[PDB]
């Protein structure tokens, strides 16, 4: 078998490995007739027509089970010969394979390191104490009633402080952007804007007089082909509809589905909202603090196996959103998916020690509470908790985010804990 | 969100839930607004465009993660009130996605029945009792030279008897059909017999004839919408082989693959050869008598949940090798798919519940003994055993496999053993 195992830097190694032309014909041959006999689909029948011909001239389909097992069968027996263990996956990087000649793949396999933090103490504990009076409900009620102020449709031009309903489609330098655009689009005011141009262009002529806008993306757009690359949006300037309050009337209160539709009803549903909203606020306040502390603290270099597979679930799954075509992947900026990934690998690395070697169970008390609360999210909590606790699968998941949390709270309780005084808007407005 | 359960047959419990249009058209919003703040593709950035319209209006790239969320989302809180539970995993059975509009889902599996084995005095064990002498070793010789004979170019008319290489392609019913042709076919005869017709026409026809072969396909043939259509297949006499026996001179013996040349050299990769497949028939007659002893004997209630698992994995494998067409997947017989799962999954209670319940521990022995076996085959045996013994991984996949022959054997030796002795020709006589 051929095989070369070289070293690229520390824990990572490139394992160049190429199978020869027969080798993978007659393995072709074998799983067409192992699969054939187990499945019962033959061609015909169990003793006719051998899988050479029909490997090589139209086995091109059952050649992604072949190179499957293949990659995975070089690799089993070369491995024990060389004592190679990837961290996890190898990430498997082929460059061609010629049909008829032989498959040369790059196995790129990491090893795993014993990691360690330090700096717990020096990682500061955000507690952003906001205890919601009715300064805080009636402050971000009005902030409600003034953002949320009813649409009317305006008499002029469009400006930054309107509301058009409208439509952008056509292309970015010729290239069909897919599903880049939104037919019926609603430009509100009040939040944030897009690209300087795009939205220039609209606020730039009147209603009714619809025309393409020339806009090139930024550099700092997430697919490589539409940034840099000019766009022409076919602009139909339909309705400007401006804000105004007319007032804080049953009409508006309604549309929040409040079924009393007093004002004092709309308060309840606000209620509502603010019980799970501070609850996942404070504690995505405290457990954002953490980890950008933890990771903060010890920026360790991690192998870039479990980054590679992170970024394989992040390419397959943003360019599913982007029309679900593949090639769309292999254009995103490879940095906006480690971000997440970095984050989760090196978090992954860190409470995994700390559970581990600091001895952390389930908790009974702290997954108690916590199934009460995700719990008093549905409509029956307390049967909740009682079918979890018969639930094993349930209790296997339930223990792993006990300790996520747990993990996170042995270092969190450790490092300097910094109770600051905040309101609700604070809260949420240094978010998003 | 609504849920109600219906008993489809017995085990059988379709909980039939409908997610209302915007218990959808939320959780797409959410899924779009999270994937865009933490992959950071917001389109243009996390302060602008509501998810809202990209949803209603494009969102159809999102359905995949939001009802792969609403699947377990519904289901997990239905089943905490009313009790209720599938064996292994619960068959999604959807309606057709109409966008604003309730998806209405049945959502349907079988729960676990008590699984015995019974009648094992009954199940009469074959040991085929052979041996690698050179009666044996010449018996196939002899074979091999009077089977495996060398191929001349026939001018004139073709035999059933005879070889031929064609090249066929056509139309079933005047419609052209996906895999189902073979440029430079070989119809070899000493093998088995192909469909009537085909061959028969092949075989009516003199060397150099251009024509076409009407022949109906079967309706017992592994697809629906080929069987028991006309096919006329575009049959060009490409090639004609008459089948001869000059020898088993060194000319058949490098043909071989033995580059030895001597015949010798034959008997060798001969007795290699016979050594391995030796080992995997008497595996494969111990092991196929014992399988289908403990299924036939004990036809048992299986949850149609296990045979759809199987059944996706079998369709995904085996549409892939038809074109990539999935939707030809649902239209192949599925009794076909149901032969090899049937055996997979009752086999998979029974065994399964033999090492349980009689506590069969992965013999250290036993499972190191198995993999030397195999190893035998690998490219270092000793080494194979020994590098495996670190990898738990794959000690668990040969905890699997040992667990499966020893809950055989535990059954085995409590079966009717009956040594019965045969040829090695006998042997894979019927198996071939």
């Known amino acids: 078998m051929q095989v070369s195992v070289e070293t690229t830097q520390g824990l990572g190694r490139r394992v160049t490995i190429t199978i020869a032309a027969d080798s993978i014909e007659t393995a072709v041959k074998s799983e067409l007739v192992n699969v054939a006999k187990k499945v019962r689909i033959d061609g015909f029948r169990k003793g006719k027509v051998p899988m050479n011909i029909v490997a090589q001239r139209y086995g091109a389909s059952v050649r992604q089970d072949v190179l499957g097992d293949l990659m995975s069968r070089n690799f089993i027996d070369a491995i024990i010969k060389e004592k190679i263990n990837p961290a996890g996956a190898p990430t498997y990087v082929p460059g061609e394979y010629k049909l008829g000649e032989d498959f040369t793949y790059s196995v790129e396999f990491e090893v795993y390191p014993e990691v360690e933090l330090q700096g717990l103490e020096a990682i500061e504990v955000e507690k952003p104490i906001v205890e919601v009076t009715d300064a805080d409900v009636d402050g971000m009620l009005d902030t409600l009633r003034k953002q949320q102020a009813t ?7 469009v400006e930054a402080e309107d509301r058009v309903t409208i ?7 010729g290239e069909e952007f897919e599903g880049g655009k939104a037919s019926d689009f609603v430009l509100a005011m009040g939040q944030g804007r897009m690209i300087p141009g795009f939205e220039d262009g609209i606020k730039g002529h009147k209603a009714g007089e619809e025309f393409t806008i020339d806009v090139t993306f930024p550099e700092e757009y997430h697919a490589e082909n539409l940034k ?3 766009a022409k949006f076919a602009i139909n300037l339909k309705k400007v509809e401006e804000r ?9 209160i309604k549309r929040f589905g409040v079924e009393d539709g007093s004002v004092e009803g709309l308060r309840a549903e606000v209620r509502k909202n603010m019980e799970r909203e501070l609850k996942s606020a404070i504690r995505n306040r405290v457990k954002s603090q953490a980890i950008e502390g933890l990771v903060k603290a010890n ?6 196996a479990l980054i590679d597979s992170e970024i394989d679930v992040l390419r397959r799954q943003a360019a599913q959103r982007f029309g679900g075509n593949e090639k769309q992947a292999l254009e995103l900026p490879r940095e906006l998916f480690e971000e997440q990934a970095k984050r989760r690998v090196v978090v992954g690395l860190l409470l995994g020690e ?9 908790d009974e008390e ?16 307390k049967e909740v908790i009682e079918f979890y606790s018969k639930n094993k699968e349930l209790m296997d998941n339930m223990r792993n985010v006990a300790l996520e949390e747990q993990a996170v709270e042995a270092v969190l309780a450790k490092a300097k804990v910094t109770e600051k005084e905040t309101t609700f808007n604070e809260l949420m407005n240094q978010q998003a």
């Open 354 to 362: 700390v559970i581990r070697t600091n001895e952390l169970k389930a």
């Open 228 to 230: 840099g690359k000019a």
């Open 151 to 157: 649409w009317k449709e305006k008499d002029g031009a």
């Open 299 to 304: 920026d360790i270099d991690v192998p870039a």
């Open 244 to 252: 105004e309050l007319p007032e804080l009337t049953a009409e508006f």
């Open 366 to 381: 702290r997954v108690k509470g916590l199934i009460e609360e995700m719990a008093s999210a549905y409509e029956d909590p």
């Open 167 to 173: 439509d952008f489609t056509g292309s970015v330098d």
